[PDB]
């Protein structure tokens, strides 16, 4: 920018999207990466492999196409993340993928976070992934209990119209239950 | 195809330059060989440029020299029309000459020594301390230029 000697960062470093020091370490395993990413409204999970001209995604799941299986609730929460992980994990298995390492990008390794919920889901789908059980949420929160109880302190529906007034961690079970047998695209 | 004649001796010449002439089958002064005009051969002649005389000879000249100084791979046998006919694919010296010039074959392929052992130039050459453009005898020659040299060394 300033001159011939000026050093311009790699594009994905400029965009503040890729941590290359963490990426290298991730690629050391020689295993596919379970890419856990979030959005204000959604949660994405991809199983990416290395390629000659860039990464290759062999399987993925988005919290949006969760409804495609009976999801009638918001998609930017814990129960959402888990299911998206399980969904991607199952598709992963179908694709012949057996193991992966969790890549949480620029997110933080906070215990009980959504990226770890995604990791929990993928593991239950059958994917073998290096993990640590006591850094994951305590199931109930994954189910969405923390939000149901939060609505107990109601007075006004936590959900604007949406579905239910007291919410449903039960809707969570019905869905997980669903994903664990048959159905299309899995 | 160019005619190569060593005009300068081995004493004091670079070794890598000497080995080049040797890979072109010339091991003595006044020895001549015929070389196809290829990239590989071109570089070799450029490296040897300062101790040799080279250029494309005329059909006639080649025939005179072939008849006069060509030899079998082994032996004294004169390489005349009959020899050429009874030993090669061609029917006479002219036919062989043309094939060489059109780079369709080689002296070896036709059972002939790759070297034409020439005679010193009758009347003397133009000197081995300067190139043609300076009046000397070294370097690339005219077809008329090569012919004169080759004929004087017939």
């Amino acid at each position: 920018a300033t001159g011939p000697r000026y050093k311009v960062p790699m594009r994905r470093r400029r965009e503040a999207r890729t941590d290359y020091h963490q990426r290298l370490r991730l690629l050391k395993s020689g295993k596919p990466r379970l890419v856990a990413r979030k959005s204000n409204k959604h949660v994405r999970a991809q199983l990416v492999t290395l390629g000659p001209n860039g990464d290759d995604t062999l399987a993925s799941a988005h919290s949006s196409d969760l409804a495609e299986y009976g999801w009638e609730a918001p998609t930017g929460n814990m129960p959402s993340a888990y299911l998206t992980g399980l969904l991607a994990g199952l598709r992963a298995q179908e694709a012949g993928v057996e193991e992966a390492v969790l890549d949480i990008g620029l997110n933080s390794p906070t215990p009980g976070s959504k990226v770890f919920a995604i990791q929990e889901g993928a593991i239950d789908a059958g994917l073998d992934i290096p993990h640590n059980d006591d850094v994951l949420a305590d199931w109930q929160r994954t189910r969405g209990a923390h939000i149901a109880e939060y609505d107990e302190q109601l007075e006004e529906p936590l959900y604007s119209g949406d579905f239910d007034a007291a919410d449903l961690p039960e809707h969570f079970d019905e869905l997980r239950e669903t994903l664990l047998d048959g159905d299309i695209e899995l | 195809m160019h005619a190569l004649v060593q005009l300068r001796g081995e004493v004091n010449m670079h070794t890598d330059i000497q080995d080049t002439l040797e890979m072109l089958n010339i091991h003595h002064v006044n020895h001549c060989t015929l070389v196809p005009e290829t990239d590989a051969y071109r570089g070799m002649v450029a490296k040897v440029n300062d101790f040799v005389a080279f250029g494309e000879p005329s059909q006639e000249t080649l025939e005179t020299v072939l008849a006069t100084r060509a030899e079998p791979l082994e032996g004294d046998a004169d390489v005349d029309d009959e020899w050429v006919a009874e030993h090669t694919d061609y029917d006479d010296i002219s036919g062989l000459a043309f094939a060489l010039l059109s780079e369709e074959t080689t002296l070896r392929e036709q059972g002939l020594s790759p070297t034409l052992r020439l005679h010193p130039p009758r009347g003397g050459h133009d000197g081995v301390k300067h190139p043609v453009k300076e009046g000397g005898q070294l370097g690339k020659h005219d077809t008329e230029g090569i012919d004169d040299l080759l004929e004087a060394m017939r």
Binding site: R5, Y6, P9, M10, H21, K28, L50 | -
Partner: protein, 95 residues
């Protein structure tokens, strides 16, 4: 040379042009080679590890197995046969 360490006279060969400065891309540090493949040796100024003695910069050897994540490349120094332990970060496929 006034000294005889490994980095003697390596000022140029182990220095990056100002623009190639900074952490190198991970892609080539994870590249995988097969036994028999021809690889060019060239230290990447930005990568500390998996290096080899600077004298061999420019060599082109034959991968013949590996040790840990590093590769074992066979070269010929002058007339002598040598084996070099080197990582992908400093190797490139020939051709």
């Amino acid at each position: 040379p006034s000294s005889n360490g490994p980095l003697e006279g390596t000022r140029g060969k182990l220095k990056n042009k100002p623009r190639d400065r900074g952490t190198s891309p991970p892609q080539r540090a994870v590249e995988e080679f097969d036994d028999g493949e021809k690889v060019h040796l060239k230290i990447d100024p930005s990568v500390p590890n998996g290096r080899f003695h600077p004298r061999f910069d420019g060599q082109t050897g034959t991968v013949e197995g590996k040790q840990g994540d590093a590769y074992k490349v066979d070269i010929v120094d002058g007339g002598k046969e040598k084996t070099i332990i080197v990582t992908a970060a400093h190797l490139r496929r020939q051709e």
